[PDB]
Design an enzyme around this catalytic site. Structure first.
Site, PDB file in Angstrom:
ATOM      1  N   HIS B  30       5.247 -72.906 -16.102  1.00  0.00           N
ATOM      2  CA  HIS B  30       4.598 -71.973 -15.972  1.00  0.00           C
ATOM      3  C   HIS B  30       4.844 -70.551 -16.782  1.00  0.00           C
ATOM      4  O   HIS B  30       4.158 -70.103 -17.240  1.00  0.00           O
ATOM      5  CB  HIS B  30       4.151 -71.548 -14.632  1.00  0.00           C
ATOM      6  CG  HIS B  30       5.576 -70.370 -13.927  1.00  0.00           C
ATOM      7  ND1 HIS B  30       6.621 -71.198 -13.205  1.00  0.00           N
ATOM      8  CD2 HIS B  30       5.769 -69.309 -13.936  1.00  0.00           C
ATOM      9  CE1 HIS B  30       7.468 -70.011 -13.056  1.00  0.00           C
ATOM     10  NE2 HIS B  30       7.083 -68.945 -13.689  1.00  0.00           N
ATOM     11  N   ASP B  52       6.750 -77.848 -11.302  1.00  0.00           N
ATOM     12  CA  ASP B  52       6.695 -76.844 -12.609  1.00  0.00           C
ATOM     13  C   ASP B  52       7.948 -76.982 -13.324  1.00  0.00           C
ATOM     14  O   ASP B  52       8.609 -75.938 -13.079  1.00  0.00           O
ATOM     15  CB  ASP B  52       6.531 -75.805 -11.608  1.00  0.00           C
ATOM     16  CG  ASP B  52       6.162 -74.388 -12.462  1.00  0.00           C
ATOM     17  OD1 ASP B  52       5.670 -74.534 -13.358  1.00  0.00           O
ATOM     18  OD2 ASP B  52       6.851 -73.483 -12.239  1.00  0.00           O
ATOM     19  N   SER B 104      12.023 -66.559 -13.549  1.00  0.00           N
ATOM     20  CA  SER B 104      11.883 -67.875 -13.843  1.00  0.00           C
ATOM     21  C   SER B 104      12.764 -68.424 -14.663  1.00  0.00           C
ATOM     22  O   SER B 104      12.786 -67.861 -15.831  1.00  0.00           O
ATOM     23  CB  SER B 104      10.260 -67.991 -14.130  1.00  0.00           C
ATOM     24  OG  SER B 104       9.619 -67.466 -13.115  1.00  0.00           O
TER      25      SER B 104
END
EC number: 3.4.21.90
Lengths: 148, 148
Positions: B30, B52, B104
């Site tokens: 992402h 992901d 992230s």
């Protein structure tokens, strides 16, 4: 610390060993017969379509018996049933003649008692046998699990 | 333990981090943009069709920068950029408000400097954030390599 190794038997003879490691019961696929343990004999094993290995999910009541494993294999000496195993140039070797019948499936351990490889076979190189093994390398990094 | 973390940037903003771990460059799928490193930016990344995450093979000249990883995650406290991460009941948590924009892809480390998880996200649980992570469990035992 061999609560994690179980004999495989065919016609009343030990053909090899099954090994509890991580969350798996592991056995070389070529080793004929059945595991000398009621709980493990009942399991369904999945045979690898690339490697000489089959594995079943460890029964949850036996998880405490499983050995730890590692991909960390610094060069030097390791432990198995017949004594010292040298790891060098990416290959495990033993003195020729240290091997015995039924060695398929025996694990190799570091001094902390982590399994670093499982023995499938061997080939002669002079005064040494070069073991054919399965092992865990850095590429096990790809088998991720999402948590949370 | 920050030679293995690289910024990902989109329109001049840090969107997240790529991490050298084992033999892979890892990045959450992402996180938009390109890695702030010429060598890594050139690589082809494979996106997981379940998770992901995307990964590329580490360039061999950067293998010495990669962090070690482990599946060994005993309960207690771990390290990341913003301080302490609790691991308990199979979940990593932080104080709510410890998180910052661009987290992230940040790794979580043990005190030996091994990566135990990569942060993808979080959700609130009261005065704590429960991190969404990728991690390595005992089932990485199935990713074997034959040697010899």
């Amino acid at each position: 610390e061999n609560d994690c190794i179980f004999e495989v038997r065919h016609e009343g003879k030990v053909t090899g060993y099954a090994c509890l490691v991580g969350d798996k019961v592991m056995k070389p696929a070529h080793v004929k017969g059945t595991i000398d343990n009621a709980d493990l004999a009942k399991l369904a094993f999945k045979r690898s379509s690339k490697y000489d290995l089959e594995c079943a999910q460890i029964p949850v009541h036996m998880k405490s018996d499983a050995s730890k494993f590692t991909h960390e294999k610094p060069e030097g000496y390791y432990n198995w049933h017949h004594g010292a195993v040298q790891y060098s140039g990416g290959r495990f070797t033993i003195p020729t003649g240290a091997g015995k019948p039924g060695d398929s499936g025996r694990p190799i351990f570091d001094n902390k008692g982590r399994v670093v490889a499982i023995v499938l076979g061997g080939a002669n190189e002079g005064t040494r046998t070069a073991l054919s093994v399965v092992t865990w390398n850095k590429d096990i990094v790809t088998k991720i699990t999402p948590e949370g």
